[PDB]
Amino acid sequence: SQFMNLEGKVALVTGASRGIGKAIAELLAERGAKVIGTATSESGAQAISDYLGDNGKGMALNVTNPESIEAVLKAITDEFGGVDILVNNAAITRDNLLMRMKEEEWSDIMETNLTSIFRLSKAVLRGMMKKRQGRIINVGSVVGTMGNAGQANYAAAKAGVIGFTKSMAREVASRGVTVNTVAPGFIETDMTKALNDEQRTATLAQVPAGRLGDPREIASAVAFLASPEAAYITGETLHVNGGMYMI
Amino acid sequence: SQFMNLEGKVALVTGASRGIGKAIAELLAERGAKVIGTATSESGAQAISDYLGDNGKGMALNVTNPESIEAVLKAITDEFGGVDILVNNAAITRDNLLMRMKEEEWSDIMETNLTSIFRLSKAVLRGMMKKRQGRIINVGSVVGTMGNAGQANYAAAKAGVIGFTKSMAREVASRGVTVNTVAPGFIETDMTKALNDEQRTATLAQVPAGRLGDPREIASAVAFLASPEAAYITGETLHVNGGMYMI
Amino acid sequence: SQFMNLEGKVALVTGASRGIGKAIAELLAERGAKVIGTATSESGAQAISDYLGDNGKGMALNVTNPESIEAVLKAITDEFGGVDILVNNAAITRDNLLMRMKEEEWSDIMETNLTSIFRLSKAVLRGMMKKRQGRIINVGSVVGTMGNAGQANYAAAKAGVIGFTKSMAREVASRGVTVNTVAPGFIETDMTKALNDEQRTATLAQVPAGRLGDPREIASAVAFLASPEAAYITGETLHVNGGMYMI
């Protein structure tokens, strides 16, 4: 149908090897987008190419490196045309209580989870503004809004992306580009599967819905915001957390 | 497709004669819901029957009257089965600066815009919780979050709906019912069309997107939250305001 | 000192017999305000007269009754001059899960906890705006922002007060009146003392600070916003909740 239809859009989804990123890439492709998913390695890029088949391709991208960003966008533009939808999903954790947090653990998070968003966003924005049409969707976290003990670096970066998003949104709204954040709660992924029973139960105790989210549920929220129908949503943070936090 | 598919769901959409409510009713029907839309008058109800055709019907409902609510829900359950999706869209304005605001202008807004949501939500919840599946979606306003001079009553009611929504979300999350608000900005409606050019311009000046929203844009957000895919979103307020306010 | 000095200000503090309201009345008096505190009963009012002594007096006030409001304001203006600081502290609870919540439990909370704020704020605003100086401070609750199962009525009312507060703040900012909310978390009161040990423990478990708040801690926040020094704070909600919720 013509509802939530992404045919004709080119989507770049960072960190698309697995979990939330993979679910995003698959759904955008299902809705008709030509999808380029990225991983930090060629092997990862190949796995992305395999799941996407005729609907797109995988590319190796170093999200903390200017040169890689330039080569990847050049290749996408040449084959597919300009990126219409950027989904900033690639992110890392370096957890520690503040008194144990290393300088490097702070700077690695800032680099990968915040400065990367500045870099990629800037790199795709010029084409979006010329077209007067574009979507930038950041995959954040409930932690950016709620805070979390042991993750002050992660929280800082995720919260920073929201402040960046609102400012970008104000800059580019009148030119038909929207900029938004989707903030997942506790989603079932390799990382959550690696927690023990006591930790899972303690985390679930804070979720009114009483279960972990599915990566597809994050995908659906991203797909919604990517759509033509979401053109009047900008500078927003869409929380998908089963009631863990309510703003 | 199976995507954002409401076949098998019965939707009650209050205040569905025109504008946002009509757009909601039409889009839910398009996505496969059986839709009952309401109006104050039997002729309004017939106009709703006429635009829905085989996909539902119109009923007269007074959202401030317990007996009317009871009769309408009875008729819906009898013919369609119990309500699966409630959209609380019926609302009024009684604008005035506080020093000119009459007691009845306050109380009428409380009754129509806040108490009605209590009454209708309570009336549909029992069925939804037995089924362990449901959706309650309130159509709010940016005014509830932002405040607006000359609309302290409307703002209070709309903000109250959010408090109600968060509490109810907490109450019924573990039983598969989500409760959310869609908060429109300045949407093109009869009321906005009746503003003079200086008033329209002044309001557009506060919208980074530089245009009014379309009722279908509000409908799209409501259809998204009504969907199976939105099961992990609860206690949330989805802002659709062209960047007029950024939370 | 000249710091946080309320000499020359007349303060009306509703529901000042005990707990938070009493703490507010006492601290405003300590900072030099002439304070009128209210209770429902004449014996309550006399207890307020007794603790305030030369720094003010107690009056019986029914915050849901227009005639009572008019009589009390008349008596205050006659003896003290017009109200400069209104503290809307009087509130009740009528807890129940929504399916057990009676119509009167809903309406009584709306009347006492939200409509009263409209009525009293309107009744004092004219004087404040003629003077181009005033303070309206609502005593809210973390429940208004967080939601709470079993308190959808209380949450709605408290959230409504915030919408009202933002709108009124917008209306009267340029005329030197500020309008704000103080939102307490779990504060030690008679009601909290009547909880059993399992209930107290469970609530403390949601407070990072690991204790209940003291009524004087709420009083301090109210005195701060009442001060000349807080003239640039308006439309704000000051959370005092030991980290129970972080906005």
Add this chain to the structure above:
Amino acid sequence: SQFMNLEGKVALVTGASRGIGKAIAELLAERGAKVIGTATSESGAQAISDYLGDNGKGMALNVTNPESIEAVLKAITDEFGGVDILVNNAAITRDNLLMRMKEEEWSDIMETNLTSIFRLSKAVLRGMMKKRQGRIINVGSVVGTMGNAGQANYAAAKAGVIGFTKSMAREVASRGVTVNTVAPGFIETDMTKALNDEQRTATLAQVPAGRLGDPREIASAVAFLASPEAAYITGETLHVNGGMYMI
């Protein structure tokens, strides 16, 4: 009096040469704190020493340099005892629309306005936690919550400080340390005085109060949060913006 009394507290106020930082340092000293204010140069440190007289001293601090931080805290501890109140006020701007924003302009803001807060906070926290008493107050900006075109870097850093603050707050609340942000709106300073008439009027048009804030008004909010009386406020953002934004 014993109200808002900081006698016995040692306060470190970064960027205290002028404006908001100077106003903070002066008021904390007025309320009885021993105050160390910092500047980036010895000349600045001397001017701080001059205004503080017997109530404290000025010190040169490079907020983006570990070694400077260590020497300054050592000197303070030796003479005054451990820092009880840290006010992170030092911050810079490197404004530009995103398409013109240089890599260096991003990284300079991240360094000075966000990473510095991580560094200084960590450096003072151990002593505060041993004492089970402490205040960390970040001077943020309305821009961190609202966003602002031309300041996506500044907004990102300021928003990041809030996410850091909430996480720190959750980490250290049970040990009597509070961590909060004060978010100024448009405050009269050298920078605002350097704007032309058209820019000032355009900015003032967005402030309901209809004037710029005074640095002393920011100081008062900081002093309040620094006080013993604010012990039950943590993880909070206190907005002082004349209604420019209302959360």
